């Protein structure tokens, strides 16, 4: 028995040159003597440039190396669900062995423009800012950006828990984060229970380079897998500015040529790659669907930056999270003013459709009045309501951690406040107006929230003026 | 014979080296065809485009799909021309990829067809026509302040989520409805959702098989994207050459072709020039936008839509785009979320054909005047947000409230807007317009209520809207 | 034949060769042991650490001390082992250098006493505690707005001069005394005076007899200073596993490891990265703080000071670091200069353990809302340099008034501030705490003077200033 075999040349920093293994394809995966994996990404004309995808320190000069003539591929199956894994599958969380069947190309070709169908379903995050004014459709690619400390990381996991009751399946990728970060995020999906469909994939910090520049593809191969059955899935990249970090070291240490800011030529590239494989596939296809939630977290709000710009300009629409916004009390700290989301419109029930509109003037005129409140105040009747009406919509658009709300209960409190039945109601009361309406709506009006629930469409007004009325003839103000 | 030998893969830029004397010359097609000879080999079916010669009978390449796969050593056949593509009737109603390889499943182009290389230069001095004539397209705010020119070049530019892919698919709509030309789009840098939805809704409205559609779609490869606007432009160039017609291009984004070129570049190995974009930017930018002129066959116009990354007008894409322009236009994220669309801004949008001589006396009076009063009207509110609009003169209330009048005027509603809205779309005459706007301003209509001018058409509909509310 | 020559000397890096088939792997140490052979050479004892294989039987090596005196073709001897540390019961009590030896001048340490390499594999994912529990430390700020977390890694940020070591010693003061467990302190790039001062204020206390020092320092050469820090953490890391005791691990200026790095890596053959560092700055950093953790064994507690280069939060040393802390402290020289110490920024701070379910709903609510005034505060400050506080409604006279009280209030006298002042420090509660800031933004004092709640702890003190000086 033989197989095609280099010799080590030169070894460090996680880079190991070969030297022979003529017939070796590009991207193909290669061991050495020692039993770790690599991968040839560099193929001289004297000289193989290799990644490792293990620890480096047992490997020396003049080491023999082996082809296996194999790309890389992944487990995929129903077994997944409920388990912490590595990048290339194998199981980190101690609850044993994985048994998984099939198995899938890490790089594969995206759905094709004639398999498309045109995004027409919402995906309810329960956010009541996001799905008011930012909706997300099923197919859908989001970016959320924002500085350090800003809620990125909370907006996400409350999305994966508001897929309860949707037969959707979810997929949390965790990239460059710290271990012990990781294993508070996965007690904290298994206390509300999102661990019954969910699959956690982690590449930590103090792992090779290699593994967190792979880890995304092995998640949307994951993916994959359940959309090309008719499922759904929805999967979180959690810092593909990480990602990119990743593999600007192994660009450097492979003396490949720079860009700027010392980025690869080819990192858009790879991210188009990587982001262009979420999709809705026409019922020929099964009806499947994939949307995926990257990240990118940007230095003191520098939205111009290289990553930043290229993971701009790739999505369907963007969410902008600001520390002023966050710590002036208003969190979530979604800036609705620059925030787009080019889908929304078919991504929204009709009975959101008909407040939204009217929501985005109210915010918007408030927005315009706030620049000039350092000079003319008592200006007119006009800009009071304005100033008055903004005010409490910013109000209703705030709520707390880790409590979803469902989108009848959304509508309604949307309608409510647009309809002007908040206007006589103290600023500083909303919240708790909120609160006690939800509980009246539970207690009384199951009518409205069933109709909603069923047509996706809103009850005649004379009933829900009649519910809101009474409603507001019991309340108590303080 | 020859045959190249690959000696270098180094992603997508790939090395080949052949015999002495019978090199490939720069810009030449190089096809790589590979049937798998054992379980460890992969099919390979990729072409490349040659960059550089390196000497020692080396070239260097940039491949045109994924590398993944080759293997040192492999048969390189050389095809001795640029990329070429089928042209002629054959492909109205067709979606291509850079290649010409059609990628709508309808079928494969007959081997027989006549195809024509993507590299050539510009039309001579000689040869160029420079008459002026305008081009109708029925929206009010660009039939009014920014008109446009037949065999010119347009721009639009703007944020994101601003509207300038519907307001390219309403010129689309509008103009193969009132003119029933050829059109080719060219989707350089194209979204797959979006070009999913631009193909179905070509075949919905019926204006497909007048048109040619190529696409660039993102997950390709820098090469690609670069060379969908040539494939797309050469395709649009045999309509005007051949048979005589008149033609328009429709591209994606123009912003998404100089990232191509800035990734190209680095790839290669150039030093970075300004902001960390190719050298040879200028030079690329002029070579695309100088075959796009009239001559005394035909006249080629253009309508291109830029991206502006976060409002910097400073950006090196934008600012040697706007050397070659004719007509500009600006939308504005401010003025899509007041509902006013298409949000063009009224000042911002310039143009050279607004002369008196060419599009009239009367049509230039009108549209200095509206550009005169919203000017004014953008002043004095600042004044008024420190100062109580009680406290202003009569003239200039009565200043404002033309101006309300006017700005909610330039709106319109689309065909293309029926899938957001339900309200469906309108065509208005630049007669009708001008009309339109010297009533107004002459004081016909300051008893109406501003609210039912928005999203209007013509100007009787205002008083059928009124109608409606009593008023 | 183990044994190598020397080939290059370029500063802190050698080159070694060995015969063939008999390199040392990376992270081992070798031996140069030299006695002048005539008068015109130094006698030398230094030591190496493997860094790259170059290949043609070539070896890269960082040097632990001054390279002064070195000779190509010296003889090089092989360990095959990497640095060891002695650990255990004997260093309790002992202050080490970088390769583990004493330097304490108390007597050397027996040549069989048990000792553990540098290098190790981090902890797993299954092997983590997550328990959050919050550790009090009598500091009025962190108390309140960014509770520090037991079993968790904290981080001081802060530019130069700002009171970073003060922090330090402050912490030190009022936990190392009560922890009942081990205390390792592993200086890494400091002053030498701060560390005799730090030896001689322990051994006073006395709490030297539970305690282990590591001192590399500004002086040495930047191995020193890159293994410095493992030289501490394996010690740590003994305790952590061996016995499963609660250990403290104080560092300081942690910086100082990326900046050694940062000199070396230039010699080394990289490439650099974007503002001069390593391309390998992230891995790095991360092989080292994943190892600084807390299992089902044993529970670590780590502080670290992180010095800010040129006052850039943004600089890549200190933006990778922020992903590894639990709770962060940001010092600002804004604060600084305007008197108010310990300058800890209120808002950049931030803290896992800040949850209505960890310190209760009354403590969130009063941090919440400070956090709220200040933020408001920080908006009004460019219309009250412009055009004054005369503008200002009603409403922010009030937010301004409580404001600068509350930040005034944030301040307090440390223990250690002592020999700068006159006034003793003080430990205050966080029930207290949170009282005094309740009753703050409640009104009660809202006739006070604003300099009467500098420097002080809880509430009633600043009454007692009120009524010392006016009334
Ligand atoms: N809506 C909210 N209400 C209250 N607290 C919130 C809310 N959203 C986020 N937080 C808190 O803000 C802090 C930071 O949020 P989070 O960690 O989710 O943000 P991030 O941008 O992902 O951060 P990191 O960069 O540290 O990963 C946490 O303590 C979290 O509990
Ligand atoms: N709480 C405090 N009370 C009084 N003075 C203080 C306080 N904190 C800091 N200072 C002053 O600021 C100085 C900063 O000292 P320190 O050594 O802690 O700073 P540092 O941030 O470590 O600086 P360096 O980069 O020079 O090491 C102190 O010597 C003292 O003069
Ligand atoms: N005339 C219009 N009427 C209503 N909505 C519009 C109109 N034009 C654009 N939009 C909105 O813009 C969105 C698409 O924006 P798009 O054309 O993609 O902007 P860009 O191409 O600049 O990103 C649609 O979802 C739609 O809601
Ligand atoms: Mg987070
Ligand atoms: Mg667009
Ligand atoms: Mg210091």
């Known amino acids: 028995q033989v197989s095609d075999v280099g010799t080590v040349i030169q070894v460090g920093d996680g880079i190991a040159r070969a030297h022979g293994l003529d017939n070796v394809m590009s991207g193909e995966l290669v061991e050495f003597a020692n039993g770790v994996m690599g991968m040839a990404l560099n193929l001289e004309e004297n000289n193989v440039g290799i990644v490792i995808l293990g620890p480096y320190t047992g490997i020396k000069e003049g080491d023999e190396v082996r082809r296996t003539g194999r790309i890389m591929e992944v487990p995929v199956g129903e077994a997944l669900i409920g388990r912490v894994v590595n990048p290339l599958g194998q199981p980190v969380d101690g609850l044993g062995p994985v048994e998984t069947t099939e198995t899938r190309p890490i790089e594969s070709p995206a759905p094709g423009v004639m398999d498309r169908r045109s995004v027409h379903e919402p995906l309810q995050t329960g956010i009541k800012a996001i799905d008011a004014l930012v909706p997300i459709g099923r197919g859908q690619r989001e970016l959320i950006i924002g500085d350090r400390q800003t809620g990125k990381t909370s907006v996400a996991i409350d999305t994966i828990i508001n897929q309860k009751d949707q037969n959707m399946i979810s997929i949390y990728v965790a990239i460059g984060q710290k271990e012990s970060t990781v294993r508070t995020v996965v007690e904290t999906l298994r206390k509300h229970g999102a661990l019954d469909y969910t699959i956690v994939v982690t590449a930590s910090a103090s792992q090779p380079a290699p593994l967190l520049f792979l880890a995304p593809y092995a998640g949307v191969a994951m993916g994959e897998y359940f959309m090309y059955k008719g499922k759904h899935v929805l999967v979180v990249y959690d810092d593909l500015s990480k990602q990119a970090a990743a593999y600007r070291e192994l660009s450097l240490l492979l003396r490949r040529p720079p860009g700027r800011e010392a980025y690869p030529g080819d990192i858009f590239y790879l991210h188009s790659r990587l982001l262009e494989r979420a999709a809705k596939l026409s019922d020929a296809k099964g009806g499947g669907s994939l949307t995926a939630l990257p990240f990118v977290e940007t230095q003191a709000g520098d939205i111009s930056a290289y990553i930043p710009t290229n993971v701009i300009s790739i999505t369907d629409g963007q969410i902008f999270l600001q520390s002023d916004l966050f710590f002036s009390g208003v969190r979530p700290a979604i800036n609705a003013g620059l925030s787009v989301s080019r889908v929304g419109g078919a991504a929204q029930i009709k009975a959101m459709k008909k407040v939204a509109g009217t929501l985005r003037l109210d915010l918007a005129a408030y927005r315009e009045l706030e620049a000039f409140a350092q000079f003319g105040s008592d200006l007119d009747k006009a800009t009071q309501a304005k100033l008055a009406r903004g005010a409490r919509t910013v109000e209703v658009l705030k709520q707390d951690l880790h409590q979803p709300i469902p989108v009848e209960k959304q509508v309604l409190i949307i309608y409510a406040l647009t309809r002007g039945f908040l206007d006589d109601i103290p600023v500083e009361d909303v919240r708790r107006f909120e609160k006690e309406f939800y509980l009246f709506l539970d207690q009384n009006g199951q009518h409205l929230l069933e109709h909603i629930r069923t047509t996706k469409d809103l009850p005649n007004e004379d009933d829900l003026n009649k519910a809101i009325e009474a409603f507001k003839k019991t309340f108590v103000v303080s | ?471």
């Open chain 2, 1 to 471: 014979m020859t045959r190249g030998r690959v000696i270098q893969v180094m992603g997508p830029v790939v090395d080949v080296k052949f015999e002495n004397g019978h090199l490939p010359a720069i810009y030449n097609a190089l096809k790589i065809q590979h049937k798998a000879r054992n379980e460890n080999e992969v099919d390979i079916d990729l072409t490349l485009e040659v960059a550089l010669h390196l000497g020692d009978d080396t070239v260097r390449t940039i491949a045109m799909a994924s590398t993944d796969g080759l293997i040192r050593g492999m048969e390189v056949i050389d095809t001795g021309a640029p990329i070429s593509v089928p042209v002629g009737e054959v492909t109205l109603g067709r979606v291509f990829n850079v290649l010409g390889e059609p990628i709508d499943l309808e079928g494969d182009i007959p081997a027989d067809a006549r195809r024509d290389p993507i590299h050539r230069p510009a039309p001579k001095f000689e040869e160029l026509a420079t008459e002026v004539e305008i081009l109708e397209t029925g929206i009010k705010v660009v039939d009014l302040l920014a008109p446009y020119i037949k065999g010119g070049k347009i721009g639009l530019f703007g944020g994101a989520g601003v509207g300038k892919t519907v307001l390219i698919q309403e010129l689309i709509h509008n103009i193969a409805q009132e003119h029933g030309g050829i059109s080719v789009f060219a989707g350089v840098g194209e979204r797959t959702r979006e070009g999913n939805d631009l193909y179905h809704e070509m075949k919905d409205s019926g204006v497909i098989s007048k048109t040619a559609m190529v696409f660039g779609q993102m997950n390709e490869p820098p090469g690609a994207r670069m060379r969908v606007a040539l494939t797309g432009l050469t395709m649009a160039e045999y309509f005007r050459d051949e048979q005589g017609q008149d033609v328009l291009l429709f591209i994606d984004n123009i912003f998404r072709f100089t990232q191509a070129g800035s990734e190209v570049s680095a790839l290669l190995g150039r030093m970075p020039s300004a902001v960390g974009y190719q050298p040879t930017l200028a030079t690329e930018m002029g070579q695309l936008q100088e075959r796009i002129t009239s001559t005394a066959k035909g006249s080629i116009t253009s309508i291109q839509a830029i991206y502006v990354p976060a409002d910097d007008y400073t950006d090196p894409a934008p600012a040697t785009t706007f050397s070659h322009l004719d007509a500009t236009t600006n939308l504005e994220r401010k003025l899509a979320e007041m509902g006013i669309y298409p949000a063009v801004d009224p000042l911002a949008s310039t143009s050279r054909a607004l002369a008196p001589e060419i599009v009239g006396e009367e049509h230039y009076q009108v549209a200095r005047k509206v550009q005169q009063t919203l000017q004014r009207y953008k002043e004095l509110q600042d004044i008024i947000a420190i100062l109580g609009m009680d406290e202003l003169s009569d003239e200039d209330k009565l200043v404002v409230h033309r101006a309300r009048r006017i700005q909610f005027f330039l709106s319109q509603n689309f065909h293309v807007a029926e899938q957001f809205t339900g309200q469906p779309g309108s065509y208005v005459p630049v007669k009708e317009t001008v009309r339109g706007f010297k009533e107004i301003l002459e004081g016909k209509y300051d008893h109406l209520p501003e609210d039912a001018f928005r999203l209007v058409g013509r100007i009787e509909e205002v008083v059928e809207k009124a109608k409606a509310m009593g008023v």
